[PDB]
Amino acid sequence: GPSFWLGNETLKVPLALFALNRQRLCERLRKNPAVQAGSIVVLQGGEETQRYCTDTGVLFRQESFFHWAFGVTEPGCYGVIDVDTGKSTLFVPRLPASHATWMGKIHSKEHFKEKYAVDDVQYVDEIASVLTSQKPSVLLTLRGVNTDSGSVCREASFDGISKFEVNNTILHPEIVECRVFKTDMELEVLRYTNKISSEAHREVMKAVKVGMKEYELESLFEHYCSRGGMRHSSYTCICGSGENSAVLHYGHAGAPNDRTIQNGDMCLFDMGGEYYCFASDITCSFPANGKFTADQKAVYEAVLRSSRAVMGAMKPGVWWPDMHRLADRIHLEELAHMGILSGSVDAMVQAHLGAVFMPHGLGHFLGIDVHDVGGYPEGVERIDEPGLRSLRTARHLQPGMVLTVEPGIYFIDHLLDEALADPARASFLNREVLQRFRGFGGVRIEEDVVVTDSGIELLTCVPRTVEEIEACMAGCDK
Amino acid sequence: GPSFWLGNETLKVPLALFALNRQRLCERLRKNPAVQAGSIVVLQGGEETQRYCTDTGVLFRQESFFHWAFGVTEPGCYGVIDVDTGKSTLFVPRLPASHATWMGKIHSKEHFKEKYAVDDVQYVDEIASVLTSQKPSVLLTLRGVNTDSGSVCREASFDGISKFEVNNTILHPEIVECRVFKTDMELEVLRYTNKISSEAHREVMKAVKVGMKEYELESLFEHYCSRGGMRHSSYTCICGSGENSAVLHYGHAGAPNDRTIQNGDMCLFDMGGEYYCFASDITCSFPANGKFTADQKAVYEAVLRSSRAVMGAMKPGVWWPDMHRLADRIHLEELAHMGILSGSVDAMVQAHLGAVFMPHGLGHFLGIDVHDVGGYPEGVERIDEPGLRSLRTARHLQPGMVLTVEPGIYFIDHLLDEALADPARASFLNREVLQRFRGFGGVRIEEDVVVTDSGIELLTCVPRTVEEIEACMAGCDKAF
Ligand code: PRO
Numbered sequence: 034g035p036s037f038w039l040g041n042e043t044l045k046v047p048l049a050l051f052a053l054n055r056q057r058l059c060e061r062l063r064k065n066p067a068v069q070a071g072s073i074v075v076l077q078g079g080e081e082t083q084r085y086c087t088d089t090g091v092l093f094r095q096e097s098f099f100h101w102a103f104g105v106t107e108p109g110c111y112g113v114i115d116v117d118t119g120k121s122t123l124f125v126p127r128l129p130a131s132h133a134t135w136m137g138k139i140h141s142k143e144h145f146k147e148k149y150a151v152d153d154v155q156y157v158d159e160i161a162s163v164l165t166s167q168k169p170s171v172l173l174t175l176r177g178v179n180t181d182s183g184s185v186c187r188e189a190s191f192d193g194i195s196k197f198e199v200n201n202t203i204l205h206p207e208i209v210e211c212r213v214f215k216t217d218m219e220l221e222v223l224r225y226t227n228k229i230s231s232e233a234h235r236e237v238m239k240a241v242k243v244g245m246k247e248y249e250l251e252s253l254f255e256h257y258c259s260r261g262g263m264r265h266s267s268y269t270c271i272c273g274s275g276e277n278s279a280v281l282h283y284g285h286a287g288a289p290n291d292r293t294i295q296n297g298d299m300c301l302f303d304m305g306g307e308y309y310c311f312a313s314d315i316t317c318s319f320p321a322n323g324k325f326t327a328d329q330k331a332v333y334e335a336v337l338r339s340s341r342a343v344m345g346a347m348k349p350g351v352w353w354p355d356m357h358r359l360a361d362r363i364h365l366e367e368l369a370h371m372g373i374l375s376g377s378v379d380a381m382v383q384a385h386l387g388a389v390f391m392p393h394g395l396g397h398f399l400g401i402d403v404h405d406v407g408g409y410p411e412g413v414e415r416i417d418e419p420g421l422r423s424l425r426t427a428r429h430l431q432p433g434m435v436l437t438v439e440p441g442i443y444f445i446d447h448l449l450d451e452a453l454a455d456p457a458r459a460s461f462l463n464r465e466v467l468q469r470f471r472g473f474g475g476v477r478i479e480e481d482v483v484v485t486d487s488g489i490e491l492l493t494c495v496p497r498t499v500e501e502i503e504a505c506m507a508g509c510d511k
Numbered sequence: 512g513p514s515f516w517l518g519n520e521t522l523k524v525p526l527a528l529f530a531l532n533r534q535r536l537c538e539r540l541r542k543n544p545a546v547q548a549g550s551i552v553v554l555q556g557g558e559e560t561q562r563y564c565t566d567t568g569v570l571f572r573q574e575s576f577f578h579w580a581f582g583v584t585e586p587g588c589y590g591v592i593d594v595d596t597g598k599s600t601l602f603v604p605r606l607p608a609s610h611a612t613w614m615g616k617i618h619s620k621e622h623f624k625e626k627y628a629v630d631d632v633q634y635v636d637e638i639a640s641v642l643t644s645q646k647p648s649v650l651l652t653l654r655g656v657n658t659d660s661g662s663v664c665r666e667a668s669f670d671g672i673s674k675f676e677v678n679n680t681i682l683h684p685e686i687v688e689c690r691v692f693k694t695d696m697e698l699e700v701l702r703y704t705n706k707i708s709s710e711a712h713r714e715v716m717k718a719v720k721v722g723m724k725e726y727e728l729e730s731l732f733e734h735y736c737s738r739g740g741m742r743h744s745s746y747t748c749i750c751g752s753g754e755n756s757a758v759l760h761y762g763h764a765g766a767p768n769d770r771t772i773q774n775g776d777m778c779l780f781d782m783g784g785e786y787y788c789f790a791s792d793i794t795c796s797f798p799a800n801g802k803f804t805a806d807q808k809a810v811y812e813a814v815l816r817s818s819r820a821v822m823g824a825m826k827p828g829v830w831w832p833d834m835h836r837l838a839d840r841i842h843l844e845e846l847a848h849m850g851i852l853s854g855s856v857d858a859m860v861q862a863h864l865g866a867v868f869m870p871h872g873l874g875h876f877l878g879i880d881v882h883d884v885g886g887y888p889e890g891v892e893r894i895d896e897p898g899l900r901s902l903r904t905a906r907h908l909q910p911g912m913v914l915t916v917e918p919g920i921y922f923i924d925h926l927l928d929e930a931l932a933d934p935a936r937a938s939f940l941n942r943e944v945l946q947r948f949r950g951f952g953g954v955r956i957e958e959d960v961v962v963t964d965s966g967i968e969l970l971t972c973v974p975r976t977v978e979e980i981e982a983c984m985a986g987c988d989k990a991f
Pocket residue numbers: 281282303393394397425439
C-alpha cells in the first residue's frame with residue numbers, strides 16, 4: 034500500500050500503520066461491556082491557527098489522537114470508525130476555487146482515499162448526513178484528562194451532532210491504552226527519529242566551542258533534523274550551559290538559550306526531532322571544552338552508572354517506581370564516594386535525600402507525544418514522595434512500552450539549602466565538599482528504549498563514556 | 512540604558528525603542544479630544560500555550576501590540592501606561608518556588624524594572640489593587656478588527672476589572688496608527704532582519720542543487736537565520752520549485768515543501784527571519800540549475816522591470832493602488848513583447864488582464880507582523896477589482912511606512928483557462944506561445960523598503976539581475 038515519504042534517505046512509513054491502530058482500537062472497544070453494537074468512533078482533527086489576531090499562520094501539526102488513528106496531515110478534517118466492522122471514513126474540507134491560487138492543488142476525495150488507505154472519503158459539510166444514514170446507536174467521542182498537563186481533551190463536535198446520542202467517557206481510556214503499546218510499524222518510526230536525533234547530537238558535540246551561544250547549538254540540531262525530514266522538534270530544545278544545566282526545562286521563552294558557553298562549563302543538551310508526529314527525546318551531557326575535570330567525571334560517571342543499571346534491570350513486570358528508587362540509591366552511593374555525602378545510604382534513602390539531587394521522574398512514556406499518554410490510568414496512583422511524585426507513570430513495565438531513561442544529578446541551590454536546614458538530612462551533607470559543587474549545574478543522560486519480552490531494546494546511539502565523549506569532541510574520526 | 516542582545520554579531524536593541532513607542536502613543540492619545548484626563552492604557556500580554564491537550568509547550572512569541580509597547584518576552588504579563596504622565600507599569604507573574612527547579616531563576620520585580628526600563632513593576636495578582644490605588648478615570652483597552660485575518664483583537668481582562676470604567680474603542684485605531692509609522696530605532700531592527708535574511712537567501716542560492724528537496728533549502732535558510740539570533744521565522748517558508756512556484760502561499764502543512772527540484776525548474780523562495788519580533792519578507796526567484804533559459808530570462812526581467820519602476824516611482828503622496836496598476840501595465844507590456852499576448856495593452860488593462868498573471872496585491876505594510884496592521888483604517892476602502900481587491904492597503908504613502916514591493920508573474924491554469932473562456936479577455940492570449948509556459952510556475956521579486964521624506968530606502972540586499980543571480984549561484988564573493 035501507500036507510504037508517507039519525504040524522499041532522500043528519510044523513512045517510508047506505511048499508511049497500514051494507522052489502519053492497524055484503528056483495528057486495535059476496535060478490538061479493544063468490542064471487548065468493553067459498556068460498548069453498544071452499532072457504535073461509531075468520531076474524532077475531529079486539528080484546525081489551522083494564526084498568531085493571536087494576526088493572519089500569521091502557524092505551521093500545522095496534527096492533533097495526536099487523530100494522527101494515531103489516521104496519519105492525516107491536512108487541517109480541518111474529521112475521521113470516523115465503525116466499531117463493529119472497522120470501516121473508516123475520512124471527512125475532508127470542501128475547498129473554494131481560490132485555494133488553487135494561494136494554497137495548491139484541490140485534490141479529489143478519491144486522491145485522499147488512496148493516499149490514506151481509508152474505506153471512504155466524504156466532505157466535512159456532509160458529516161451529519163453521512164452519519165445519519167449509518168443509523169448509529171451512539172457516537173463515541175474523545176474526552177478525558179491528560180495526566181501531565183491536566184488539560185481536558187477536546188471532544189468532536191459538528192453541526193447537527195445534537196441529534197445523536199453521544200458518549201464521551203468510553204473512548205478516552207481505550208484509545209490511550211492502545212497508544213501505550215507500540216506496534217512494530219510504530220517502532221520503526223521511533224528508530225528513525227532516534228537515529229536522526231542521535232546523529233544531530235553527535236554533530237552538536239563536535240561543533241561546540243567555548244564562546245558560542247547556546248542557541249547556536251539549537252540551530253545546528255534543528256538544521257540536521259530538518260534536513261532529515263523533521264520540520265518540527267518534539268519539544269523546545271533545552272541547551273543549558275554552566276549553571277543553566279541545573280534548570281530542567283531551560284530554553285523556553287523566559288530563559289531562551291541565550292547564554293555564552295564558557296570554559297569549564299558543563300553542557301546539558303536535551304533535544305529531539307519529530308518525524309511524521311513521532312517523537313524522540315535525547316539528552317547528552319559533556320564539558321564545553323572537551324575535557325572532563327575530576328569533579329565533572331565523578332558526577333557524570335555516577336549518572337552513567339544509574340543509566341546503565343536502570344536499562345539493565347528493565348524487563349516485563351518491573352515496577353517503574355522501583356527503577357526510580359534504584360537510580361536514587363546509586364546516585365547517593367556515588368555522591369557518598371565523592372565525599373559530598375556521609376553516613377548510611379539506607380538512612381539517606383529513608384530521608385528521601387535522592388530527590389534533593391534528582392527532583393524529577395526517572396523517565397516517561399514516549400510516542401506521538403514526547404510525554405506520552407497513559408502513565409496514570411484509573412487504578413494507578415501517584416506516589417506522594419519527593420522525586421516519585423514527579424514520575425509521569427507508576428505502572429509496571431510490559432512489552433511494547435517505550436520509555437525514556439533519564440536519571441540526572443543537579444546542584445540546585447534552593448533544594449540543597451532546604452536539606453541543609455533539615456536536621457534529618459543535613460547530617461548527611463558535607464558542606465565543605467558540597468561548596469565546591471555549588472554552581473556546577475548538572476548532568477542528565479537520557480536514552481529512549483523499548484520494553485521487549487526479556488529486557489529492552491536501546492533506540493538511542495550517542496557517545497556515552499568519558500573516553501567516547503572526549504574523542505568525539507576532539508574531532509577524532511571514530 | 513539597557514539593550515536586548517543575543518551576542519556575537521547580533522543587533523543590540525535599546526529598550527529605549529519601546530519607551531519611545533509608549534511616549535508616541537501617549538502623545539497621540541493626549542491630542543485625541545475624546546480621551547479623558549486620568550486615562551490608563553491597559554494591555555494584556557500573551558500567555559504560554561501547549562499543543563492541544565498535551566503538555567508539549569509551544570515556544571512563546573509575544574503578542575504584537577504588547578511587544579510594540581513593552582518589548583517583554585515573558586508570558587503571562589500585563590502592561591499599563593498612564594496617558595497623562597506616560598508612567599509605565601509592568602505586571603509580572605508571581606511564580607511558584609518550583610519554577611526555580613524546572614524553568615529557571617525567579618527574578619525579582621526590580622530585575623524586570625531594570626531589564627525593561629519601565630517606571631514600576633508589580634505582580635499580576637495585584638493589578639486590581641494597584642489600579643484602584645491610582646484612581647484612574649477610564650481604562651483604555653484594545654479591541655478592533657485585523658483587516659488581513661478578520662479576527663478581533665483580544666481585550667485585556669482581569670479579576671475585578673468590572674469595577675472600573677472601560678473604553679475599548681479609542682485605543683485600537685490610535686496604537687495601529689503609531690505602528691504604521693516606524694521610528695528610527697525600529698528601522699535599525701528592520702535593517703538587521705533584512706541583512707540576515709538577505710545573507711541567508713544568498714547562501715540558499717549558492718547551495719541549491721538539482722535533486723534537492725525544497726525543504727532542504729527551508730532548513731538551510733532557518734539555520735542561517737537562527738545562527739543570527741532569529742529563533743522564529745516571520746511566516747512559514749515558501750520554497751516553491753517548478754509548478755509550485757505558481758502557488759502563492761506554498762509550503763503550508765498541506766503542501767509542505769516536499770518536491771524534488773528538477774533541471775530546468777524555476778525556484779521561487781519567499782522566506783524571512785524574525786528578530787526580537789520584528790519581521791522581514793524577501794522573495795528571490797532563480798533557475799534551479801544556475802542558468803536562465805531565454806524563456807526564464809524574459810519572464811524574470813519583466814518582473815524586474817516592474818519592481819524597479821515601482822521602486823523608482825514610490826514617494827510620499829503616491830496612492831498605493833496606482834503602483835499596483837503600474838506593475839500590471841508593465842507586466843502586460845512585457846508579456847506582449849514576449850509574444851504571449853497580442854493586441855492593445857490599453858485594452859488589456861481595461862479588461863483587467865493583469866490580474867490573470869498577478870492575482871495578489873503588489874505589497875503590504877511590514878513591521879512587527881509580516882502583514883502589518885493599519886492598511887485599511889476607517890475611511891479607506893478596498894477596491895472591488897481583480898488583483899486590487901487583494902491589496903492589503905489602499906492608503907497613500909507617507910514617510911516612515913515600511914512596505915514590501917513584490918510584483919510577480921505566474922502561469923496559473925484555472926485563471927488562464929477562465930480568461931480563455933471569456934470573450935472579453937481570450938483574444939489577447941496567444942495559445943501557440945502560451946502553451947510553452949504552462950507549468951512554468953512563476954516569478955516573484957520581493958524587496959522590503961522604507962518610505963522616506965522623498966522616495967524610499969531599500970532594506971533588502973540580494974542579487975537581482977540575471978547576471979548577478981548567475982554569479983551568486985556560481986559562488987562569487989558578494990563584493991564582486
Ligand atoms: O519533564 C520531564 O519529566 C523530564 C525531566 C527532565 C527534563 N524532562
